[PDB]
């Protein structure tokens, strides 16, 4: 079934953006330098020895890329470290610290691997920004291909190009396109990780993210997961556009826990819980006058509270009139038995095991849009079941700050909280550094794939063996 190609306008926009990229001053890439051994004591030795070599003229004459390439081909032992560096000075200072077992922002170092697989966090609320995904789309052939694949599916489903949005700095995102585009980007980022050998042990979803979570847990084909986010997204945009003024439901974050909310809500009979986000943070929704009132009641009581700006009212009665069209649109999707674990924040945070019964039903998407997102509960259930590595696939890492609030509450004070892209951070670097972290903690990640195949020998270094 012939899928639409990249649009004319997208090609035009790409050309322009490449032209402009080609004119910025090239910045030195971030190179990851892996050092490992069966023993931490020996890992530090190799570190200090590599550093000593990099000090010498031969080592100063070798590119960081070559040193990283050689390093990446050593046997990767139980105890691991990666110094992420842009030049020789950075590299040496990082290695000094690995050797001294001292800490630094560009160094990661552990005595041994994390016991349980990573949980991939698929969220999206509040993570959008204007240029999101663009730079990685221009710079990374594997990302770009997956973006283009979702872009084709959305043209087919919805009639416009998400990739045109990504490329056009003049174009901003609204209720509908914000969602379909964060989705595109979640899909492509996860597949970029798969390409480098990463896998999720489990997923957890948060509202918009739930459809990407289904895909990566093998619960729906890419097509059907695109179908799920497309129906949610366009129906939500259309539904708000037809409502006016104080009939538009708002959302806000307030520093009250589930228990405090049952009390507080007796004053605000139309407020509902959108996302139980953290143990003492809840995104609530309803009529503006009640939202403003709960906001002021919080600010008064000495409690954090921030109103959001989106006339989306996911997880409120404002979704009531879309349920029927939603049900109708997703007739025909095929839920499949998952291939990894799922913490279902739609089902109150409950775990479904690889091999379980399909849970990606039409009724599932109906349930998820209308009802509360049990995010903190899902994350608590992961922590309690031995998971300690949380990786957010996002254009900006807002849900990991929520994850941290739950990990800490549950007694897990040193979780591995791994972000992907971020606004104000080079996207190619970010991915490097995310892959370095995965590698370091022992999770699947073929670190050889972080360097292109050697053509000649100057692509290697004479690293002290």
């Amino acid at each position: 079934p012939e899928l639409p190609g990249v649009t004319e306008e997208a090609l035009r926009l790409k050309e322009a953006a490449l032209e402009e990229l080609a004119a910025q001053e090239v910045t030195a890439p971030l190179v990851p330098l892996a050092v490992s051994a069966f023993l931490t004591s020996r890992k530090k030795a190799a570190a200090a020895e590599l550093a000593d070599w990099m000090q010498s003229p031969e080592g100063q004459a070798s590119s960081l890329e070559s040193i990283g390439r050689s390093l990446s081909r050593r046997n990767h032992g139980r105890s691991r470290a990666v110094v992420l560096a842009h030049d020789h000075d950075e590299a040496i200072k990082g290695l000094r610290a690995v050797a001294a077992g001292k800490q630094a922002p560009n160094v990661f170092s552990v005595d041994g691997p994390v016991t349980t697989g990573p949980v991939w966090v698929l969220a999206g609320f509040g993570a959008q920004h204007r240029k999101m995904g663009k730079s990685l789309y221009l710079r990374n052939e594997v990302f770009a291909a997956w973006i283009e694949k979702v872009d084709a599916l959305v043209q087919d489903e919805l009639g416009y190009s998400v990739l045109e949005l990504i490329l056009d700095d003049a174009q901003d995102y609204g209720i509908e396109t914000t969602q379909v585009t964060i989705f595109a980007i979640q899909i492509a980022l996860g597949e970029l990780l798969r390409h480098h050998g990463a896998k999720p042990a489990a997923v957890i979803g948060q509202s918009l993210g739930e459809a990407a979570s289904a895909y990566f847990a093998g619960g729906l084909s890419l097509r059907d997961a695109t179908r799920a986010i497309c129906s949610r997204s366009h129906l939500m945009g259309e539904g708000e556009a037809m409502l006016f003024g104080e009939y538009i439901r708002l959302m806000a974050l307030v520093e009250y826990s589930a228990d405090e909310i049952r009390e507080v809500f007796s004053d605000f009979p139309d407020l509902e819980v959108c996302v139980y986000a953290a143990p003492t943070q809840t995104v609530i929704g309803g009529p503006p006058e009640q939202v403003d009132a709960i906001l002021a009641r919080a600010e008064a009581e000495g409690k954090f509270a921030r109103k959001f700006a989106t006339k989306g009212a996911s997880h409120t009665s404002q979704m009531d009139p879309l349920l029927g069209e939603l049900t109708a649109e997703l007739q025909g999707i095929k839920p499949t038995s998952p291939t990894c674990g799922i913490f279902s924040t739609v089902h109150e945070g409950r775990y479904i095991k690889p091999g379980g019964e399909p849970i990606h039903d039409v009724e599932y998407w109906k349930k998820g849009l209308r009802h509360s997102v049990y995010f903190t509960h899902g994350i608590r259930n992961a922590v309690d079941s031995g998971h300690t590595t949380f990786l957010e696939l996002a254009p900006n890492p807002v849900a990991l700050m929520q994850v941290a609030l739950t990990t800490a509450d549950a007694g897990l004070h040193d979780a591995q909280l791994i972000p992907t892209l971020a606004r104000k951070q080079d996207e190619v670097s970010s991915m490097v550094s995310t892959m370095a972290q995965l590698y370091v903690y022992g999770h699947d990640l073929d670190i050889r794939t972080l360097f292109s195949r050697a053509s000649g020998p100057q692509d290697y270094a004479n690293i002290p063996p």
């Binding site: 990991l400 700050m401 909280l417 972000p419 951070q425 550094s433």
Partner: peptide, 9 residues
């Protein structure tokens, strides 16, 4: 404040 290389802070 999550930094340069993936750090909650």
């Amino acid at each position: 404040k999550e930094n340069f290389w993936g750090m909650a802070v």
